[PDB]
């Protein structure tokens, strides 16, 4: 019944700088609180446990602080490898009913980079299939916040389409959206112009890139 809330849903900060994470707990969990670190596609990593004690073999930059219902995994000079989602685990009640925090992404904050929209039409081969897929890539950009709109014949219709951002990269450290309007065969043929409006923060103004069937 214990709720563990990690307030900073997302924390953008730069390497070398100090990053701070705060795990909020329902009732008191005393000191039975651990912190984990998860790289995309990896098993978590036990960082801290018992609230303020680092796990064997862990960088001293990770500071475990707190007790009661207020814990803090503060990090001194954050590191390139220190990018990951952080999790707090509560394990104080008994019977065992341990709960995890909802997370916190420790993303690298960099320069507001604008997205270069590439609209890809549905390959005829794919259209011969029975459907059509218009891919509207959004290469290398930062604040993952990038509202995209699919306008069919200048129609703000918003439905049959599905986005997919990528993780933070290595070198560039940017994101790449990917909105995909998947229409039919008889309705793809029923419409003329297919536009994709990207409204990014680092975009001086809305940038519509489209195409007409052909």
């Amino acid at each position: 019944d214990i709720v563990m809330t990690q307030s900073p849903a997302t924390l953008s900060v730069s390497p070398g700088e100090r990053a701070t994470l705060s795990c909020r707990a329902s009732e008191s969990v005393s000191s039975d609180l651990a912190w984990y670190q998860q790289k995309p596609g990896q098993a978590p990593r036990l960082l801290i446990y018992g609230a303020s004690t680092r796990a064997t073999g862990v960088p001293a930059r990770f500071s475990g602080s707190g007790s009661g219902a207020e814990f803090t995994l503060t990090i001194s000079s954050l590191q390139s490898e220190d990018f990951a989602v952080y999790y707090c685990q509560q394990y104080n009640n008994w019977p065992p009913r341990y709960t995890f925090g909802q997370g916190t992404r420790l993303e690298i904050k960099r320069t507001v980079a604008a997205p270069s929209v590439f609209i890809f039409p549905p390959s005829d081969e794919q259209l011969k299939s029975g459907t059509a897929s218009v891919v509207c890539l959004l290469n290398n950009f930062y604040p993952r916040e990038a509202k995209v709109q699919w306008k069919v014949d200048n129609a703000l219709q918003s439905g049959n389409s599905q986005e997919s951002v990528t993780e933070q990269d290595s070198k560039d450290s940017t994101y790449s959206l990917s909105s995909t309007l998947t229409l039919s065969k008889a309705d793809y043929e029923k419409h003329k112009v297919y536009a994709c409006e990207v409204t990014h923060q680092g975009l001086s103004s809305p940038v519509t890139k489209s195409f007409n069937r052909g």
Partner: protein, 229 residues
């Protein structure tokens, strides 16, 4: 200092039951209490339960009581996690995790909640869909959109199942300057991702672009020539 190994990823259908194994090696088995931690795609860790191995007792997560079980075979040194009545939401990567407890074989027991040793993770896809290789569709390089420097093109692995899928360009060479997006679950029950690579236009017509998509599950390896069409 143990090393945990898990059973293979399994594709189970709704209302079924799945059993994931977890081999514990590198130390004294009974001195560890093992915990299963599941994580749905995009989602975060959810405590499934923990077995106080030596005692052969296991407590579970409220929202799972009844449909989950944790057992351990001290003989073979394995831990198991069984979920019955599988729903779609149960689809997740089930992690095996353990922690040392102390000379438990001697009465000493710390009974730790945290998890020091984690498994490689086992993915379980609970869906009504059926195993089916993908279909790659080339994304015509923006020739009438981008020029002057480089142009971006790619592939569109559509309608595949269960998961996952690997992607490489030019037999595995042009893996640089590529942004392979995480797959996405379509209403049909199938997934579909996309791979792209922003490369110089002046190289369109000599370096026949081909994304190499593989899907071991269906055992269907696909190659598609992305001609600057």
């Amino acid at each position: 200092e143990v090393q945990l190994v898990e059973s293979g990823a399994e594709v189970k259908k709704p209302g079924s039951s799945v059993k994931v194994s977890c081999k514990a090696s590198g130390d004294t088995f009974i001195r560890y209490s093992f915990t299963w931690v599941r994580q749905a795609p995009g989602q975060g860790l959810e405590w499934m339960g923990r077995i106080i191995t030596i005692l052969d007792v296991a407590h579970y997560a409220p929202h799972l009581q009844g449909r989950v079980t944790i057992t351990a075979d001290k003989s073979t040194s394995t831990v198991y996690l069984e979920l019955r009545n599988l729903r779609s939401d149960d689809t997740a990567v089930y992690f095996c995790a353990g922690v040392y407890e102390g000379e438990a074989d001697e009465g000493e027991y710390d009974n730790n909640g945290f998890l020091k040793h984690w498994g490689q993770g086992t993915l379980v896809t609970v869906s009504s869909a059926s195993t089916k290789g993908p279909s790659v569709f080339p994304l015509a390089p923006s020739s009438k959109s981008t020029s002057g420097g480089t142009a971006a093109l790619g592939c569109l692995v559509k309608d595949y199942f269960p998961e996952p899928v690997t992607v490489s360009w030019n037999s595995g060479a042009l893996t640089s300057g590529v942004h392979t997006f995480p797959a996405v679950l379509q209403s049909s029950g199938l997934y579909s991702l996309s791979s792209v690579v922003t490369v110089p236009s002046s190289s369109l017509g000599t370096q026949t672009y081909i994304c190499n998509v593989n899907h071991k599950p269906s055992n269907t390896k696909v190659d598609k020539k992305v001609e600057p069409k």
